[PDB]
């Protein structure tokens, strides 16, 4: 199997405009939303049909209760941060947790928090400690690091539980997540050569330009990998043409174990 990841995000907002939720949580496998909860629906619900089909109503009912508890803990935690930063107005608090199962079989795990969209606290599950970015974080770090049982619980969850959930969801969603749609690749002129790929899945792809068999990264413009809307992706890369000398340019594309070369005549 290729590399895969499972991640859960929380967002709290302290003074949201009317109608907008003070709390949202979304889970992802790779790029795919799999679950969603917010303080307006107050229900945890599937976001992918293969989650809805493989997890019984008692799963959703239970995690709905757990996310209502998270919603309240996030409100309290954000109230305390904003008081300690001495900040008025609307501020955000975010959490991200997850793991990756790499192609070679190795694993990774991560857990971190942000305040107003900037790193705040970062967990190291090998040294069993929290990195604090400022003195407000440093106060929280002290309280959390005094609870060594909870550090050990988080290490176990990242290393064993998260990877087990990920393998379970990967099997649920295998028709979607383990498929391969190769790219359709073309070269155009607009003076620069554009190497364009579309229709591919998974989104991970590597496109570059080589000039007389040499790669010059600082000369290449790299487009983003963008969703096409139908479950596949598109991307591009461009390089500027030298009007004073001929050169042999080639677009190189790697995707899911297959390499492609388009030599420009």
């Amino acid at each position, epitope marked *: 199997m290729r590399t895969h990841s499972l991640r859960y995000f929380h967002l709290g907002v302290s003074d949201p405009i009317h109608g907008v939720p003070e709390f949202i949580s979304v889970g992802y496998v790779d790029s795919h939303p799999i679950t969603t909860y917010d303080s307006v629906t107050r229900q945890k619900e599937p976001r992918a049909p293969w989650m809805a089909e493989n997890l019984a109503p008692d*799963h959703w*009912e*239970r*995690y709905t*209760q*757990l996310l*209502r*508890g*998270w*919603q*309240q*803990m996030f409100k309290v935690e954000l109230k305390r941060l904003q008081r300690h930063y001495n900040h008025s107005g609307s501020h955000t608090y975010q959490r991200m947790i997850g793991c990756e199962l790499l192609e070679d079989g190795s694993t990774t795990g991560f857990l971190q928090y942000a305040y107003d969209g900037q790193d705040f606290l970062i967990f190291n599950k090998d040294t069993l400690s929290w990195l604090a970015v400022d003195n407000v974080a440093h106060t929280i770090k002290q309280a959390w690091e005094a*609870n060594q*049982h*909870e550090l*050990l*619980y*988080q*290490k*176990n*969850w990242l290393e*064993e*539980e998260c990877i*087990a*959930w990920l393998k379970r969801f990967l099997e649920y969603g295998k028709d979607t997540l383990q498929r391969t749609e190769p790219p359709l690749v073309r070269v155009n002129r607009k003076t620069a050569l554009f190497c364009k790929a579309h229709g591919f899945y998974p989104p991970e792809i590597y496109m570059t330009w080589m000039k007389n068999g040499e790669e010059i990264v600082q000369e290449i413009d790299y487009g983003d990998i963008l969703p096409s809307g139908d479950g596949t992706y598109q991307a591009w890369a461009s390089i500027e043409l030298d009007p004073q000398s001929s050169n042999l340019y080639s677009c190189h594309v790697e995707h899911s174990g297959v390499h492609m070369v388009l030599q420009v005549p």
Partner: antibody
Amino acid sequence: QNIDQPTEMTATEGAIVQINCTYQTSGFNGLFWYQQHAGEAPTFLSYNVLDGLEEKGRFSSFLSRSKGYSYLLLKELQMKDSASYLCAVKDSNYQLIWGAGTKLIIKP
Amino acid sequence: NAGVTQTPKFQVLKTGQSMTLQCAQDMNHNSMYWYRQDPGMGLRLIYYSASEGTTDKGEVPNGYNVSRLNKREFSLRLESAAPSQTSVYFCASSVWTGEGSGELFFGEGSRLTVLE
């Protein structure tokens, strides 16, 4: 899913006793031991979630995740250690599964 | 600084009679629980309340209902007592539901006997 511990154990004052707890669960988020004197409320003794031994006073708690087993070790037993000992495991959905409890009887 | 206070300690009931058990905690805990304990088996959750403003069934909800009246209090209602509800009932609380390692703090227990 199930959790198993002996119904009762009897040992002599001053000695050592090991109370075993084995569990079969889908997922594992840690194992708890509680003490419950006859007619009283359970109170928290220990929590293990990685492999190994943790000491607290005369009581130690051991966990092996791969064999799905823990023990509560009581050294230098006293009469006041007479009680039931309950083990509980937190499963993949963070729900506790409780063992039926081990009644420890101490011979003076 | 009382911890978890539940009442009553003892109660005899006739089949069909109604009863409310009370439970309060002064620990500013978010999560509360009602368990029954019977001989030969582990504690069984009846209903729980992960946070103020929400409740849900446990493993043995039938014949019971609960009210999370506020952050402190979580009552257990037996609308029409059955002899199978003879048991010892424990209320418990924890700081919240997300603390993986968080322990339960128990009340002193309520012994109920239901007789025809």
